């Protein structure tokens, strides 16, 4: 008859690929979920069906027993014996660990159970409940800790493969420090293990005010009496409309990033996000 | 949807692991290092392209039903097997400012393939 690869949520064979093809023929294999049509009807009665129904009616479920089944890490039957291969993380070989996703896990199989379902790109990252500050971490052998924009800890192999060029391979550290190469910053950033910031383009000078500071890319410098330096930011971005309300360094609360870009931009000075939500003393 | 296992020869999605080194985003991506992005590959024939299950099915069907009788600018545009569902992936990089940003890039990888 006919041969399919999937039975729908609601039954009905779907995903046909071998027509004119007896059952025990299409049923021999160990790859499960493979179901069966018993009738030949190549005409668009077939097309029809995908509409009228989840699909092909009178589907036939090859195995109702993990008989000759096959599936990368194992089978378990259960319910209306609808044997579904699931998750055989295989345990043995300690910890209550963190996740490369940022989420915490009570332990590793914990995770291996998850890496099974969706993300196989799901890593580990390091042992122990996940952290929001480089406070901790041995980082597997050789992998500097660092911190996200949300201020969170991650471990990594700093890439040390890339030093020197160039007209202006040559840029200014938000920490002062003239860096020689775009990737070079990346390096000292990583070594420092925290966002430093491209203060702006070119070699650094001591100036005392934004005017003085050039700026291409059409960014617009802004200053910060904090350390006393300039900063070549980008204000050409708008929003008037996800979201979030935050409270900032100067002693004020706002709306989105969007909210106070031109806060600083349109006005003067650079600002930093004190914290999310509001903050106040009544 | 699909699983490109066995001697399959249709629009199945073959697993594939991409190294940022191997392409050179090594440097502007922090981790994750590499990862699987896979893709779509296989012949896109007849009584099967509308059977795909994929989003692109019914339409694809209502199309071929044309070139079947070599009609307009159609007899010579083959249904090629493509992606029809892609979940996003969260990573880590230097935004244009060289700061450190964790975001989830949408449809960075392929859930299902389909005929078209």
């Amino acid at each position: 008859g006919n041969c399919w690869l999937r039975q729908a949520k609601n039954g009905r064979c779907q995903v046909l690929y071998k027509t004119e093809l007896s059952k025990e023929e299409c049923c021999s294999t160990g790859r499960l979920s493979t179901s069966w049509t018993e009738e030949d009807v190549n005409d668009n009665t077939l097309f029809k069906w995908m509409i009228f129904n989840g699909g092909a009616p009178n589907c036939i479920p090859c195995k109702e027993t993990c008989e000759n089944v096959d599936c990368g890490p194992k089978c378990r039957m259960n319910k209306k014996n609808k044997p579904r291969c699931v998750c055989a993380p295989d345990c043995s070989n300690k910890g209550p660990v963190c996740g490369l996703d940022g989420k915490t896990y009570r332990n590793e199989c914990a995770l291996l159970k998850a890496r099974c379902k969706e993300q196989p790109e799901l890593e580990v990252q390091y042992q122990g409940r996940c952290k929001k500050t480089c406070r901790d971490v041995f980082c597997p052998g050789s992998s500097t800790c660092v911190v996200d924009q949300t201020n969170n800890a991650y471990c990594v192999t700093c890439n040390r493969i890339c030093p020197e060029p160039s007209s202006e391979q040559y840029l200014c550290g938000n920490d002062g420090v003239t860096y020689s190469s775009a990737c070079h910053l990346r390096k000292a950033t990583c070594l420092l293990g925290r966002s430093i910031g491209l203060a702006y383009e070119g070699k650094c000078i001591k100036a005392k005010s934004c005017e003085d500071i050039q700026c291409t890319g059409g960014k617009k410098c802004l200053w910060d009496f904090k350390v006393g330096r300039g900063r070549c930011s980008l204000c050409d971005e708008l929003c008037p409309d996800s979201d979030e309300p935050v409270c900032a360094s100067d002693n004020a609360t706002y709306a989105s990033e969007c909210a106070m870009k031109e806060a600083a931009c349109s006005s003067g000075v650079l600002l930093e996000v004190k914290h999310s939500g509001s903050c106040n003393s009544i | 949807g699909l699983e490109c296992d066995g001697k399959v020869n249709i629009c199945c999605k073959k697993q594939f692991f991409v190294s940022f080194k191997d392409i050179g985003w090594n440097d502007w991506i922090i981790a994750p290092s590499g990862y699987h992005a896979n893709y779509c590959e296989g012949e896109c024939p007849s009584h099967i392209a509308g059977t795909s299950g994929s989003s692109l099915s019914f339409h694809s069907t209502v199309i071929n039903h044309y070139r079947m009788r070599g009609h307009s600018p159609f007899a010579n545009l083959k249904s090629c097997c493509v992606p029809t569902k892609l979940r996003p992936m969260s990573m880590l990089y230097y935004d244009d400012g060289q700061n450190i940003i964790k975001k989830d890039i949408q449809n960075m990888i392929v859930e299902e393939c389909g005929c078209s």
Partner: peptide, 10 residues
């Protein structure tokens, strides 16, 4: 105490 290098967006 600590710090908080400015940002891009969210």
């Amino acid at each position: 105490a600590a710090a908080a290098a400015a940002a891009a967006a969210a």
